[PDB]
Amino acid sequence: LHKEPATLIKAIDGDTLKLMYKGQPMTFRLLLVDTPETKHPKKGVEKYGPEASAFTKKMVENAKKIEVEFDKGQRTDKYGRGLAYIYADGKMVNEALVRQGLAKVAYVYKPNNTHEQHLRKSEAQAKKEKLNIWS
Template sequence: MKMKDVKSLITGGVILIAIALYMVFGQEPPTKEEAESEHIAIEQVERATGKKAVTVDFIKAYDGDTVQVEMDGKKEKVRFLMVDTPEMNYQKGEPMPYAKEGLLYTKEKLMNAREVQIVFDSGKERDHYERVLAYVFADGTLLQEELLTEGLAAVRFINKGNDTLVDEFKALEEEAKADQKGIWQHQNYLQKDGFHPENVN
């Protein structure tokens, strides 16, 4: 083999090694969002809605989808966007099936969180009861996502402008249905007009 051919082989080999090293080590590390792509990150929601997260202080939970917080020095009732949990029925008798489980889940998550944040969507920020409408995060974990995943909530009350995450929420709901988690263990418990406790054995 001629010296020229040897040099060509060496040069080619060095280039291949350099390419391989770049492919292995030269790529940028995955972002936090990519590393946690199985969850809905707060940065993802901020980007999708165009709204910045607001830090609040948790006070108490009324049920799985409604809490009281302190925001800007004022007590506010916050209704979780696009999810519905069974009602506690404080004034009407017994809690609906899975109402206590939803309440305890939300209460535990928010009580033990180092930081509680809410993110508004691009639509109305309050409902007709003057409750704040928002996505609610406990230490970066989206409560709506958790409740849907556990089968403790259903996707409901979808309104234009406040429906940015509707596809993600519906996908989570379908997974919980397929796994027959929580409320989905009982056929016809949830109907178009709401929950029907009489259908839970």
């Protein structure tokens, strides 16, 4: 895998961002993580949804450099959203969320599961530390 540059257009949710990628505006879904959501009327605004959403927003808005890293399988989902690992100043946003107890590791689909181990270790630590969702 390799990272490629991207430019923030807009943070939409904890797990969804609008980026300029290869000169086109595109919606990205963060690979392998589920955050509580602010949108979706199925539940509305879940608990920690605003926090997850604010965390992603600050992290990407305050970055010098944003990079996207596609995994080895499908690069878009059925909604046309890019499926990627997002990095803010070299720090993976998907992991940061999980490390802070603001996201769970998603149901995984090989072969898009390169960082699965890594994220699960972070999730286990946030649970051990009883952070946010785990409190």
